[PDB]
Amino acid sequence: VRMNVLADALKCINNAEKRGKRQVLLRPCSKVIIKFLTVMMKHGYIGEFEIVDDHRSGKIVVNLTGRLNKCGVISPRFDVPINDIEKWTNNLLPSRQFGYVVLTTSGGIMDHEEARRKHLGGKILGFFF
Amino acid sequence: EDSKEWVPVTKLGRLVREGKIKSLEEIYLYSLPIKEFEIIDFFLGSSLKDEVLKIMPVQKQTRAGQRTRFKAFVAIGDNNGHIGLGVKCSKEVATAIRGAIILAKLSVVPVRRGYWGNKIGKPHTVPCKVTGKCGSVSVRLIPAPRGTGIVSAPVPKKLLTMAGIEDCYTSARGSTGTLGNFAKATYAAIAKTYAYLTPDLWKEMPLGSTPYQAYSDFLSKPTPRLH
Amino acid sequence: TKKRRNGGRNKHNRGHVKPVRCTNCARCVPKDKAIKKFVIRNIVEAAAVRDITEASIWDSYVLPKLYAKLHYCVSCAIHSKVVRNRSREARRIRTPPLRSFPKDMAR
Amino acid sequence: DILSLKEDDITKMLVATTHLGSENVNFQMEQYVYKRRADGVNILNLGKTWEKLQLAARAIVAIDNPSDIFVISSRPIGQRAVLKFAKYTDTTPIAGRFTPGAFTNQIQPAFREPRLLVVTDPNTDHQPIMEASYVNIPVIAFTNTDSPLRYIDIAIPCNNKSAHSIGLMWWLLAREVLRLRGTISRSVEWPVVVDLFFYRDPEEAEKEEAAAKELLPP
Amino acid sequence: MGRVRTKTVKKAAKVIIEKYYTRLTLDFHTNKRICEEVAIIPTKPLRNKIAGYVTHLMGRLRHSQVRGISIKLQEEERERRDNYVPAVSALEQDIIEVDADTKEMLKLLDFHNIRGLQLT
Amino acid sequence: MQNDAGEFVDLYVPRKCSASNRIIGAKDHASIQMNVVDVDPETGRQTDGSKTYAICGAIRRMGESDDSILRLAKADGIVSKN
RNA sequence: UCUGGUGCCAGCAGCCGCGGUAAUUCCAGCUCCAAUAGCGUAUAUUAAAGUUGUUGCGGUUAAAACGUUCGUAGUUGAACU
RNA sequence: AGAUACCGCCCUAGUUCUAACCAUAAACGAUGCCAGCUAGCAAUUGGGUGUAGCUACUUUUAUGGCUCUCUCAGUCGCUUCCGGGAAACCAAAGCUUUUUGGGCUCCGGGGGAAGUAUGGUUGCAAAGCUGAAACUUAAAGGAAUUGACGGAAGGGCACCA
């Protein structure tokens, strides 16, 4: 059964962009995963998505551009401090030019460029480039 | 070094001979096939070195009983970012070498090299991490930082000095003791270097000029006219 | 390697299915792994039929037909040439052809 | 706007069976169907073809050399409308076989370098359309509502089965390609009537004498 | 018993379709003699194999000619072909007999909302 | 790929698709660059310059380049009346 | 693809392979190449090994989904503040 | 030649039913289970809902049969991916990106010796579930290709038939 909403709405994005659709329907939008796309929205990768509010769990109809290459989740959510945050950017992201590993730090859900200046650590929540 | 100048049998080989374009990347920009081998040694060829890799025999069982085709692997390359493999079997080893060089001069593909975390001083190795398959052998390519001399087997060692890349880390999954399928698995990676959508390329662009339609009724002539 | 996606035939949602007996061989081969021939035959060859319709007292007496089903061992239907050794692309064709003649196997 | 519906040649749509299609609807092509009646038949939106015939007019033009723009119908029912597309234009017609590779070979002397194929029916001769994706050439096409739309743009949904249908808008595609940089003075009614572009007969059915004569003597 | 003229007799058999369509006729002994000047046959007794074919060629040609040849008049009868039947158009001119529901198609699509008719 | 003084010096810029923005490779031999010109309002008087669309091979090989121009043509003013 | 010797012999060779009175592989002469006050051999051990796989394998046919389903320990668990 | 065989005859334990035991099969889809996604095309099993679509006749209606049109859970079938794989091939055997990540469980680590020896456990027995090493070995194996061109079918040829 769904042991992640974040996997069952990020492979569902990634399977629908390798075919090049312009809109993906994800289900059922935990507020964990809205603030994951909001990290991806403000770096260009995702269009302005829409949350259909049925009072069961929710649905989102997410617009997208086509700049995405691989937007997956890491499970289980490994607690990452600040000193071992670069062992998870080296072996994961394609180059240190671009890409992000999203963290759920103690302050909020943020990527690995904003967390290393704000000096926060947390768990790995997923990645996109 | 012609020494006898040859006629352009194709269309854009005449445009090359007409001087309609002086940009090899203009062919690569619209992805139209270089079909005759006399195109690129007009654009390139100034001591552009190639070396054979692999000329081991290949047999076939007949009635009386086993006859050999010698298959050659030649690798041609521009040290400012162009590459090619030659794959051609023949009767004997002289025309195996020379016949594949034409195939090596037709598979010539540009190489994208770039930076990793520091935009300083002549883009070096690779923009990202790429890989390519052909028959079980995968080769990931890692952007190595500056002055980190080539980390690979001798088959892509001689191949990536011909590619305009500073240095590389690589991790070759598969049966790489087949010295010909190793070489062809590197090229699917390097051809993907201009197929990865970096955020360096998110602007729209000037859309191109359509070299057919821009040079259209200057080919309404029926003559094979050069300069 | 797996030479057919069917294997024999029709073994899906069963597990295991009943066997029948071959005719020429008298094997015990499955019902679905069986060359079946629902043979309809005229009784009197339709060439000696005019000898018999001479002796018919009634309205020339339209003749009854013979009806049987020929459950076949696979190794004893290739041997009797109901089926033969197709090509690997012709292996995949099931329904074609009828498309031959008038009534066969009678003769 | 006089790229409008233009009633003066919409009545010919209704006779030449251009408003019908197959029972196969082809999941890439349901924006072109308007409704499916009884008998499983499809009344296709020929009004959507109106914008696409003008788009087919816009697609051939802006090519300054109209010699390398090719019209093809390999199946014999449309092999007359392909030939008289060249009596108007500079377009090369080819009917019948191709010798593949008709584009992807250079030792041969029968190779061509076109820029935009015009195939009458793609499922009949997609075997050169498969050659038409090695040399960066678009394939415009007329399509029935069942067609394999691999590599083709732009499909045009009329009927593509009857001889009166393929005869009709092959002339209408020949119409606005000469309204577009052909300058026939603003769609004056043609010397060429609506089916000189036509398949002559079901060959060889009923065919009397030449110059359209009736039967005067008994 | 070949039952067609077998080996490579199209050195002459498809040069006489347009280059020598005339300059011969159905007589076999005439075109026995016209072959000697049109090509230098270096050893002659090949001559009647590449002459005797016209008995089969022109017979196949003058009634229902077969594929792959041109006579400069086999569809230069296209000049006597262009039948213009008056008046090939919408003869009913609107038209009335249609697919029994496509009036409502051409209500929304079309202004021309003329007389109609339907059959099932 | 930039350097110190802001420079695209890689070798060139590859094209991108018009309806999907996928990059057209060096050996995408099934890449169409169609050129479509509109008219002066009623009919005629053909302008220069084409409202040019480009489509990679993988959109054609899955076969919806038919529609991929059709609704590009809606917004761009090429084709109305759907 | 040196010169004499021997002739499935003597022997060599980590593996592949050599040798059966022309041996590029033996034994010697004449040379040559590697590292160099060094270097060879044996055992162990790490890397090689994406052949132990957390990063990171494989399980239709190459080795490998329990015959079947229940089921406790265990491991994992929808959204919501 | 041999024939403890194939072929042929009567047959015994067995097949049969009951009440127990046994616990293995190529027990196979050589493919664990729950979950999300990704495509066409055609059939059918089951249920639902609009077709005065037809249609059996109490009168048409109520029903039944089918018709096309939907719709669930699928299962078959075939076609190829933006799929994948060494291939054979597979809408999963794909989404195992550029060593990746939904969760859980079982199993393998060259070939033999060997599912042997031994201990333990189950069993009335047969046997089952567990399960090594010594020594030996440079290959065993998989999917495909060309020849070989044989109780392999097909189509043909010859007085060295």
Which element (helix H / strand E) includes A87? Answer: helix A87-90
Which residues, 6 or more positions from F59, have their beta carbon under 8 angstroms from its beta carbon? A20, F17, F19, F20, F22, F65, F68
Residue reference for tokens 């617009």: A63
What would the two tokens of residue D114 be? Answer: 């076109």
CA angle, C96 as apex, C95 and C99 as ends, to 5°?
A: 130
How many contacts does D have with F, using Cβ atoms within 8 A? 100
Which nt is closest to the CA of C88, judged by C1'? H88
- Is the CB of residue B82 less than 8 Å from the CB of residue B75? no
CA angle, B144 as apex, B142 and B146 as ends, to 5°?
A: 160
Distance of alpha carbon B9 from alpha carbon B36, whole angstroms: 8
Which amino acid belongs to residue B183?
A
Which residues, 6 or more positions from B170, have their beta carbon under 8 angstroms from its beta carbon? B139, B140, B141, B142, B151, B152, B156
What would the two tokens of residue B198 be? Answer: 């970096």
Residues of F in contact with A65 (CB under 8 A): 21
Which of D145, D153, D156, D183 has the most F C-beta neighbours within 10 Å, making it the best mutation to test the interface with F? D153
Select the residue of D59, D153, D183 nearest F65 (Cβ to Cβ).
D153
Which of F2, F4, F13 has the most B C-beta neighbours within 10 Å, making it the best mutation to test the interface with B? F13
For chain C, the first-to-last Cα distance in angstroms comes to 40
Residue C102 CB coordination number (10 Å): 5
Distance of alpha carbon B119 from alpha carbon F7, whole angstroms: 10
What would the two tokens of residue A78 be? Answer: 């490994």
Q: Which of residues 43-82 of F touch D (CB under 8 A)?
A: 43-44, 46, 50, 55, 57, 60-70, 73, 78-82
Rounded to whole angstroms, the distance from the CA of residue B53 to the C1' of nucleotide G4 is: 40
CA angle, E37 as apex, E35 and E43 as ends, to 5°?
A: 70
User: Which residues numbered 1-30 in chain C sit less than 7 A from strand G, measured from CB?
Assistant: 1-2
Q: What does D130-195 look like in DSSP terms, one character per residue?
A: TGGGSS---EEEEE-SS---TT---EEES--SSHHHHHHHHHHHHHHTSSSSS--TTTPPPSS-TT
Distance of alpha carbon B74 from alpha carbon B65, whole angstroms: 29
Distance of alpha carbon C82 from alpha carbon C74, whole angstroms: 10
Rounded to whole angstroms, the distance from the CA of residue C33 to the C1' of nucleotide G60 is: 21
Per-residue flag: A32 CB under 7 A of strand G? yes
D204 cis-preceded (ω within 30 degrees of 0): yes
Burial of residue B9, with CB atoms counted within 10 A of its CB: 0-12 exposed, 13-18 middle, 19 or more buried: middle
Cβ pair D64:B220 closer than 8 A? yes
Half-sphere exposure of C47 (CA within 13 A, CB side): 3
- Is the CB of residue B172 less than 8 Å from the CB of residue B116? no
Residue B119 CB coordination number (10 Å): 15
- Is the CB of residue A29 less than 8 Å from the CB of residue A53? no
- Is the CB of residue D91 less than 8 Å from the CB of residue D81? no
Ramachandran sector of residue E3 (left: φ over 0; alpha: ψ -120 to 50; beta: rest): left
| Residues pairing with B109 in the sheet | B83
Cβ pair F62:A19 closer than 8 A? yes
D46-60 vs D163-176: helix crossing angle, rounded to 10: 50
Q: For strands C38-42 and C65-69, give the pairing.
A: antiparallel
Distance of alpha carbon F51 from alpha carbon F70, whole angstroms: 13
Residue F41 CB coordination number (10 Å): 10
- Is the CB of residue B69 less than 8 Å from the CB of residue B87? no
Distance of alpha carbon B73 from alpha carbon B183, whole angstroms: 9
- Name the phi and psi angles at D167, rounded to 5: -75, -25
Q: For strands C38-42 and A59-63, give the pairing.
A: unpaired
Nucleotides on chain H that have an atom closer than 7 A to a protein CB are: 25, 28-31, 34-42, 53, 68-69, 75-79, 81-82, 85-90, 93-95, 97-103, 142-144, 146-148, 151-154
Distance of alpha carbon F51 from alpha carbon D61, whole angstroms: 13
Distance of alpha carbon A61 from alpha carbon A22, whole angstroms: 10
Which element (helix H / strand E) includes B3? Answer: none
Which of E9, E56, E48 lies closest to E32 in space, CA to CA? E48
Distance of alpha carbon B156 from alpha carbon B181, whole angstroms: 11
Q: Which chains touch D (3 or more CB pairs under 8 A)?
A: B, E, F
B223 touches chain D (CB under 8 A): no
What would the two tokens of residue B215 be? Answer: 């040079």
For chain F, the first-to-last Cα distance in angstroms comes to 42
- Name the phi and psi angles at D52, rounded to 5: -80, -25
Which of D20, D172, D149 lies closest to F67 in space, CA to CA? D149
Which amino acid belongs to residue A94?
P
**Pairs from A31-38 (Cβ < 8 Å, separation ≥ 24):** A32/A5, A32/A6, A32/A104, A32/A109, A32/A125, A33/A5, A33/A6, A33/A9, A34/A60, A35/A108, A35/A109, A36/A6, A36/A10, A36/A102, A36/A109, A36/A125, A36/A126, A37/A62, A38/A109
Distance of alpha carbon E72 from alpha carbon D82, whole angstroms: 21
Q: Which chains touch A (3 or more CB pairs under 8 A)?
A: B, F
What would the two tokens of residue C39 be? Answer: 């043979």
Which of D173, D161, D164, D158 lies closest to D200 in space, CA to CA? D164
Q: Coil, strand, or helix at residue D56?
A: helix
What would the two tokens of residue C73 be? Answer: 């061992």
Cβ pair F29:D48 closer than 8 A? no
* Technique that determined the structure: cryo-EM
User: Which residues numbered 53-92 in chain A sit less than 7 A from strand H, measured from CB?
Assistant: 69-70, 72-76, 88, 91-92
Distance of alpha carbon B159 from alpha carbon B190, whole angstroms: 11
CA distance readout (Å), A52 to A11, A25, A30, A55, A56: 20, 10, 13, 9, 11
What would the two tokens of residue A118 be? Answer: 């704000």
Residues of A in contact with F58 (CB under 8 A): 20
Residue reference for tokens 């924006």: D31
Q: Coil, strand, or helix at residue B153?
A: coil
Which of A1, A12, A2 lies closest to A72 in space, CA to CA? A12
**Chain-centre distance for alpha carbon F33:** 6
CA distance readout (Å), B107 to B17, B37, D1, F31: 20, 10, 51, 18
What would the two tokens of residue B154 be? Answer: 């001798």
| Residues pairing with E117 in the sheet | E97
Q: Coil, strand, or helix at residue B32?
A: coil
How many contacts does D have with E, using Cβ atoms within 8 A? 62
CA angle, D51 as apex, D45 and D56 as ends, to 5°?
A: 115
What would the two tokens of residue B211 be? Answer: 């070299």
Q: For strands E97-98 and E117-118, give the pairing.
A: parallel
Rounded to whole angstroms, the distance from the CA of residue B163 to the C1' of nucleotide H125 is: 77
Q: Coil, strand, or helix at residue E99?
A: coil
CA distance readout (Å), C28 to C8, C19, C68, C76: 14, 6, 18, 12
Which of B129, B40, B124 lies closest to B84 in space, CA to CA? B40
Which nt is closest to the CA of A9, judged by C1'? H36
User: Which residues numbered 18-77 in chain C sit less than 7 A from strand H, measured from CB?
Assistant: none
A56 touches chain F (CB under 8 A): no
Which of B192, B87, B202, B49 lies closest to B129 in space, CA to CA? B192
To one decimal place, what's the resolution in Å?
Answer: 3.0
Burial of residue D59, with CB atoms counted within 10 A of its CB: 0-12 exposed, 13-18 middle, 19 or more buried: buried
Ramachandran sector of residue B6 (left: φ over 0; alpha: ψ -120 to 50; beta: rest): beta
Which of B119, B125, B198 has the most A C-beta neighbours within 10 Å, making it the best mutation to test the interface with A? B198
What would the two tokens of residue D26 be? Answer: 């082809």
Listed in order, strand segments (DSSP E) in chain C are 19-20, 29-30, 38-42, 65-69
Distance of alpha carbon B216 from alpha carbon B29, whole angstroms: 18
Distance of alpha carbon B3 from alpha carbon D26, whole angstroms: 57
Cβ pair B220:D62 closer than 8 A? no
Fill in the DSSP letter of residue C63.
P
Which amino acid belongs to residue B206?
P
Which amino acid belongs to residue B207?
L
B65 cis-preceded (ω within 30 degrees of 0): yes
Distance of alpha carbon C52 from alpha carbon D188, whole angstroms: 81
For chain E, the first-to-last Cα distance in angstroms comes to 62
Distance of alpha carbon A124 from alpha carbon B1, whole angstroms: 61
Distance of alpha carbon F1 from alpha carbon F16, whole angstroms: 16
**How far is the alpha carbon of F81 from chain A, nearest alpha carbon, in Å?**
23
Distance of alpha carbon B134 from alpha carbon D214, whole angstroms: 70
CA angle, B131 as apex, F19 and A86 as ends, to 5°?
A: 95
Q: What does F8-74 look like in DSSP terms, one character per residue?
A: --SS----B-SSS-PBP-TT-TT-EEE-----SSSS--PPSS---EEE-HHHHHHT-HHHHHHTHHH
Distance of alpha carbon F49 from alpha carbon E102, whole angstroms: 40
What would the two tokens of residue D51 be? Answer: 């914008």
Fill in the DSSP letter of residue B2.
-
Which of A102, A106, A108 lies closest to A125 in space, CA to CA? A102
Q: Which of residues 95-114 of B touch A (CB under 8 A)?
A: 114
Which residues, 6 or more positions from D10, have their beta carbon under 8 angstroms from its beta carbon? E110, E112
Which amino acid belongs to residue B202?
W
D11 touches chain E (CB under 8 A): yes
Residue reference for tokens 């259209």: B216
Cβ pair B197:F22 closer than 8 A? yes
Half-sphere exposure of B12 (CA within 13 A, CB side): 25
Which element (helix H / strand E) includes C51? Answer: helix C49-54
Per-residue flag: B66 CB under 7 A of strand H? no
Q: For strands C19-20 and B109-110, give the pairing.
A: unpaired
How many contacts does A have with B, using Cβ atoms within 8 A? 29
Alpha helices, H only, chain E = 35-38, 54-62, 102-108
Distance of alpha carbon F3 from alpha carbon C19, whole angstroms: 78
- Is the CB of residue D21 less than 8 Å from the CB of residue D42? yes
**How far is the alpha carbon of F4 from chain D, nearest alpha carbon, in Å?**
37
Fill in the DSSP letter of residue B84.
E
CA angle, D47 as apex, D44 and D48 as ends, to 5°?
A: 80
Rounded to whole angstroms, the distance from the CA of residue B66 to the C1' of nucleotide H146 is: 10
Per-residue flag: D160 CB under 7 A of strand H? no
**How far is the alpha carbon of F71 from chain A, nearest alpha carbon, in Å?**
13
Half-sphere exposure of D182 (CA within 13 A, CB side): 20
Cβ pair E99:D43 closer than 8 A? yes
Which element (helix H / strand E) includes E118? Answer: strand E117-118
**Pairs from D96-101 (Cβ < 8 Å, separation ≥ 24):** D98/D74, D98/D125, D98/D127, D98/D128, D98/D131, D100/D127, D100/D128, D100/D131, D101/D131, D101/D134
| Residues pairing with D94 in the sheet | D72
Half-sphere exposure of E59 (CA within 13 A, CB side): 7
What would the two tokens of residue D176 be? Answer: 């606005």
Cβ pair D106:B32 closer than 8 A? no
What would the two tokens of residue D5 be? Answer: 């519906």
**Chain-centre distance for alpha carbon E82:** 15
Which nt is closest to the CA of B61, judged by C1'? H147
Cβ pair B32:D135 closer than 8 A? yes
Which element (helix H / strand E) includes A110? Answer: strand A109-110
B36 touches chain D (CB under 8 A): yes
CA angle, B191 as apex, B188 and B195 as ends, to 5°?
A: 115
Which of E61, E80, E49, E50 lies closest to E22 in space, CA to CA? E61
